[PDB]
């Protein structure tokens, strides 16, 4: 097929990289009229030692390849090389709500028939639990609005991304990592959850919040939680508490409307990075409390499993441990502290340096870095998607920049077969 294909290279150097380039650039050209360009993709990519650092070049003939090798080796790029050694899958990160936008699900629902059969899967059950079309929400002119709308169309664009991952892309997760009810898709993935069970658990609770909105308000602070607890704690507040531990130097604070809003008026004047956080509820605190009875009743029925990849609980108050996603863990999870930096940590501690967060925009990325700075790690925090960025060729470019990471991945799936060709080897 005349169809635009991945070419992976690599080498030890940026330098080194470019000399491949060129050599590969003058092989190309003096073989083209005997090479298929699929087997020449094919033996780049499984046929091939990947070495730490990575580039890729897309072309859909061995012409326009040749000119994008040798874009490649005239240029004068700073090629980062693999933070991972292909031992372990990426961590997928569920970051929460404030991601969403419009029309975020039409260029995937198009390009990945994996994300349009996930969301085609969830669009009877969301229909049924929370009384709208999750396919409407995703594609419409406006951004999806309210919190009963907003949190089952995150969830479903979460789910539907890690779905193509998997199936689509041969990338099967190393970790999973949530942040508040980024834990519902989490426990899809992990295997805590069935995917039917995990929407009526993001549907029921988004249902149940609608009932408090307005009951309170949440604002991020550029100190660590230590710190604001000290502050907190002197000031003789106690209508207000540290709702989220997102990186060692960063905090979200929740609770009372006009407390907040005090506290965010002293840390900016005090030249503090302080900021209220637009919420319809102040979760994590206890404004939630009139409302955990009722959750515990709706989610009687939510049947867990033992989770089949490592989770790590940002609920829990070790992450190490392998959470029991009960109605009871969904009630903790909204009222406890997101203790998302902890969860972070301990998935770097065991080894895991490739980050990828699977949302409509990224929330905690920059959240993930200053964890891995804080332990003197070299990590990647890669987005999925962004904000109105176009998707021609769907997911592939997450896959390329998971290759150029380091993140062990299955190249059967992308390049499922063709002939070793006798391509040259850099020494």
């Keep these: 097929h005349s169809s635009p294909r991945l070419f992976m290279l690599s080498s030890t150097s940026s330098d080194a990289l470019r000399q491949t380039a060129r050599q590969l650039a ?3 050209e003096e073989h083209q009229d005997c090479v298929a360009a699929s087997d020449l993709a094919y033996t780049l990519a499984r046929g091939r030692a990947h070495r730490p650092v990575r580039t890729a070049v897309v072309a859909a003939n061995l012409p326009e390849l040749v000119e994008g090798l040798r874009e490649v080796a005239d240029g004068d790029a700073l090629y980062d090389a693999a933070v991972g050694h292909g031992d372990r899958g990426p961590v997928w990160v569920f970051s929460g709500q404030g991601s969403q936008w419009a029309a975020m699900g039409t260029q995937l629902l198009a390009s990945e028939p994996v994300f349009a059969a996930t969301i085609a899967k969830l669009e009877p059950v969301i229909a049924a639990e929370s009384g709208f079309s999750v396919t409407e929400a995703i594609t419409a002119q406006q951004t999806v609005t309210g919190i009963d709308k907003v949190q089952p169309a995150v969830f479903a664009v979460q789910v539907a991304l890690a779905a193509t991952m998997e199936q689509t892309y041969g990338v099967r997760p190393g970790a999973v990592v949530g ?3 980024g834990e519902s898709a989490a426990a899809v993935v992990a295997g805590a959850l069935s995917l039917e069970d995990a929407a009526r658990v993001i549907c029921r609770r988004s249902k149940l919040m609608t009932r408090i909105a307005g009951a309170g308000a949440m604002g991020s602070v ?13 000031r003789g507040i106690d209508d207000v508490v540290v709702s989220v531990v997102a990186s060692p130097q960063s905090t979200v604070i929740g609770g009372t409307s006009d407390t907040v809003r005090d506290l965010i008026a002293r840390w900016e004047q005090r030249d503090v990075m302080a900021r209220e956080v637009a919420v319809d509820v102040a979760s994590h605190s206890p404004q939630v409390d009139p409302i955990l009875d ?3 009743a709706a989610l009687a029925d939510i049947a867990p499993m033992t989770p089949k990849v490592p989770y790590y609980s940002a609920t829990l108050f ?11 863990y969904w009630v903790d999870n909204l009222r406890n502290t997101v203790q998302f930096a902890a969860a972070v940590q301990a998935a770097m501690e065991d080894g895991y340096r490739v980050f990828a967060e699977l949302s409509p925009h990224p929330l905690l990325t920059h959240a993930v870095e200053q964890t891995g700075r804080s332990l003197d790690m070299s990590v990647a925090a890669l987005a999925g998607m962004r904000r109105e960025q176009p998707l021609p060729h769907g997911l592939r470019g997450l896959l390329t920049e998971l290759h150029r990471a380091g993140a062990a991945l299955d190249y059967s799936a992308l390049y499922p077969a063709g002939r070793l060709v006798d391509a040259p080897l850099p020494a």
């Design 26 to 28: 003058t092989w190309v």
């Design 179 to 181: 942040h508040s009810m």
């Design 222 to 234: 550029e100190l660590p939680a230590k710190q604001v607890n000290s502050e907190l704690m002197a």
């Design 294 to 296: 009722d959750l515990a």
């Design 318 to 328: 070790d992450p190490r441990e392998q959470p029991v996603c009960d109605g009871a």
